[model samples]
Target: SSMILKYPYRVVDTHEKLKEAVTSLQGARSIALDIEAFCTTDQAKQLGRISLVQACSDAKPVVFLFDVLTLTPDVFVKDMQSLLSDREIRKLFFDCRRDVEALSCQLGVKPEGVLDLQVFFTAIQWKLRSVNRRSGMGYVLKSVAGLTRQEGDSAVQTAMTLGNRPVWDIRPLPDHFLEYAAGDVRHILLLSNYLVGNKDVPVDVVAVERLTAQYVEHYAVGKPVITEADATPAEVNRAWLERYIGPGGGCHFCGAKGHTEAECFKKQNGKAKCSFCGEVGHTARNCFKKHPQLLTCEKCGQLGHTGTSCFRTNPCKHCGGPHSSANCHKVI
Candidate 1:
């Protein structure tokens, strides 16, 4: 069966639209889901703020730029549970274990029918290893499928990995950000199809899928309990500030003091100031107030000057020592 679904980017703007989108795909055999969150760290608190939720059925993809401040966990739980409870519908995601944990904590919904592509890829790697091959699914996808995913150094991926980046709490997300979110789920479906085709039928596919779901579910419920206790001190101290400022006030950089570095007035002035002697026109190294340190000679390993400044008439070419090349005792 060809992948058939609807793609609605604006359905998150209103309850009716969101309901309509979910209602349309209520019984879909499978749907792909992705989420983006902003995170920040205070002395004791590590906060994760949900920013976007993207989902797709066989036919279409939907991106929801959730207003985390206004949106309550109860409402989010209610809506998500409606989707998760349906056994007929399977949810596809890329590296979704953490996503599932965040969703369960933030929305109080245990995700069901979840399939993770990373887990699938890990199984493929295991199979390849059994046969004495070093092939990985990422390598196979690039070589056999001709589909190249964004391979390295993504700003979004980097921020998420850091665990302390400012949340994208804006009410209406920019178009480019939404498109990028949508693309994550869209590409995974294509990759999944490619992987399924290359492998034999009844091959560990079901086991991998089930294990992915169970592991995520177990982590979502259990691991958080351990982390939650550890997170209590931060949550309590910051609870008052978090309430007043909502989800957008913490400084994501340095995780120190109030206000973000992006908005800091001190950082702005420092950008224009010279590093040496705090001068406006010249930097510290060039400032007259500072004295230069002693220099080491590269040619003779001597202090105070360069190779050209050496008092010796001739210098060795081999190893750049004090002696000439022919006089050196060094062996190759």
Candidate 2:
């Protein structure tokens, strides 16, 4: 992380400012919503305090960071609910579940008309040498919009949010913290505009339903049986791409960086080159097979082979079948 970006931002502390902000937000026709919540080991995951609620708009001030710590329940209802729950407002969030959970805990509100691109970008998950997860606001901003996020600029953590914001430090929010909060929705406005109508990306309203359903389930009367839905078009795209361009999984033909199986179908396909020991003869692609951490196997100072697979092993990388790498016909 480098530094929180410089964007026009205003902090909302009073109800009058809140009302004005919400009015501006609703009239903007489009809004990008993100929130920062704080929790401690003393509290539950979803029960974090709604520390800050940031909204990006094409309207005046450009961005607003509402300090949830200062607002009352009446304020939330009077100035926030109608705007957030309005289906026509078109509120966009990167991955909204946590924000939804935070609001549900602190404000008793959940947003509607959300266009969470985290679901859509699953259509384009690919291997990255330096990064872990494929679809995130920062990741997509850097990849899709060519804008980079700096250190300590994240809005929320992922599914397993083990490290949450400290409880005591959020209310009297520091200047740097406020700068970071403003950036939460900085790139969102641009991304929502660029991605939805972009030809290469297909926005699926159905996937948005599926993504939101994951967050709203606990609110039901009882544990309802939600049968697993089949993988949508966007789901399938990410599935195959991640498998092909795994962190250690690279070009099967030649040991290279940043190429997936489908994208680089030049030489041998199923069996990949050992990204570890590139000596020769080793056809095993699994980085963990004969190599642990790095290719390390003395074979008790005895075996004739130095690799995991010779010309015999390693079933089709896609689907196990007795055939050449190019002959693999894996399906969803």
Candidate 3:
């Protein structure tokens, strides 16, 4: 059976091959679509150029390398758009948002009937487990589906500090990378089946999971109007952090300043008043009483405004200093 379906596993190098492959899956009820594009420094060039598209069903897997740099076929995009918009055909992906953005921008295809397995796994009653030490959608998928791809394997296991490496660009993909990319969406249909067959799973749990998934989808693909005025500076910083540093860029609170939100002093309320000078806004560090402008008065031996300001100052009784016998300087 694997040998029979093996041809579909080969990469489609041309538009004709892609069309023929699409024709093969014409009756598929559910198909998983995965695309890979390289990241570039230039904003315009960074658009995920669709290096490959993996469409998977129960029958076989079709891999399409659109070759955005070479292919100029209008029919490919039109057919892809049509397939994506087909209401009867459900499209599954692990992370549909990035793929959808890439497809929509590169091929002008806004994929409909999209189902993200990452979101699905989060929603379902069955605990999606992963053996990978790292925490992420990919790790979750690997853990739940018992699958691993060699491409991201090294990066996943590496304990190196973040931001030390160049960002991964999905453009101009090599053969191995393309295979790894397609493999992401390949397992969804099987995983989804396994999830559905688990009848012991609770419905309410599924509903909540679905709700969370929809919320994410709405924000990602729906382009819901979000007013910047209502968003805090921290929220704005976080958005920037996600773009440059990925989602796992350290703790969200304190802006990765090495402190937890609970322990952040900046978020604390009120002020510490100085007991010596009855002044607000500063602690003992900046206390003015500790360093008075004037010299210490012989009468009271206290710095600043002299004996008049000191309640302990009085006519000298012992050594002609301005202090009562009861107020003599004693270390004890």
Candidate 4:
């Protein structure tokens, strides 16, 4: 499998080496990035400490693997923060949701100007079909970057197996681990270019860019990784789709106008809840209720009637009539 193939890599162990790598990284046109963290046991279900941060310069195939074990946060934070936070330099990543959390959770660094290939690839797939599924990094590579499925699968298998080692805390990482880390980021830049330059599928790059930027902002909050097993509610998916698709685009899943399936009641098995009437079986778009303000009595602060028809049990303030004070003749 091509997964086990070696690539040029440098390990940054000391503060001085990190600074030297930073200098090279400062002027890079773009960087393909990945991180290796020790995963907690399935029973524990917690984020593991990051061990290696891998980045590939767009100008070269060499991967820089930053060692977090030797270089503490004090050294890592100073130079890395500027690069991670810089909006001008684009960082290429594949499904970086966990990477965002790991970077922020351990180093207190929030990544900006990220171009997530997973989101972009999905958007491209959406243009061709109306599916709501997310493609993994392996599938993305095979589909777009011309990598064989065996290559992608084996690469991921190698990384996943070595990444979960309980003894990863030891110094002088195993040679195979270094190779696995380097391989993870090596092809990302190439894949990013393929999507950008390909003219086969006509998609709105700006729209996809906006979606990618939105994802970075959303996940950079440092929340724990959400496993795929948790099914997102239909309404939440609808709201998210509405934000990105805006108005005019029909739902790809159900062919309904003005919304997508991620939030579609019909497509995503959602129950209808009207925002206007606070009722079920319909949404605000089709609600037939009167304007909420018109249903409220300004004088009595009661629902289902206006001030002109407010007939409170209490007497009027001025005329002492059965009607509310606002309808009293003395006040008029």
Q: Against the true structure, whose lDDT is highest?
A: 4
RMSD of 2: 17.9
Of 1 and 2, the candidate ahead on lDDT is 2
Off by more than 4 A, model 3: 1-8, 42-47, 61-69, 125-137, 154-173, 203-332
Model 1 residue 230 distance off true place after TM-score fit, in angstroms = 20
Off by over 4 Å in 4: 1-7, 42-46, 149-164, 222-242, 245-332
**Winner on TM-score (1 vs 2):** 2
Q: lDDT tens string, model 1, 1-332?
A: 22311244553645665566667567577777777666656542323666667676654444444443445555555666877766567777766655777776776666777776655654443333221122333564575466555632456556556756563665566665565566566666666665554555223556556656555655577334344311332121123222322232334454544455585666666564566667686666555446333566778776555767767656777788886787788853
Question: What local lDDT score does residue 113 receive in model 1, on the 0 to 100 scale?
Answer: 75
Q: Give the clash count for each candidate.
A: 9, 4, 10, 3
Considering only N, C-alpha and C atoms within 3 Å, which residue pairs clash in candidate 2? 1-150, 1-151, 2-150, 2-151
Alpha-carbon runs more than 4 Å astray in model 1 = 1-8, 42-47, 61-71, 130-144, 151-164, 196-202, 222-332
List RMSD in Å for every model shown.
Answer: 19.1, 17.9, 17.6, 22.0
TM per candidate = 0.55, 0.59, 0.51, 0.64
Displacement of the residue 146 alpha carbon in candidate 2, Å: 1.9
Q: Could you give candidate 4's per-residue lDDT for residues 80-162 as a string of tens digits?
A: 89988887888888777667767776777888778777666656545444343567667777777667544434544565556
Error at 151, model 4, angstroms:
6.2
Instruction: TM-score for candidate 1, please give it.
Output: 0.55
lDDT of 4: 0.68
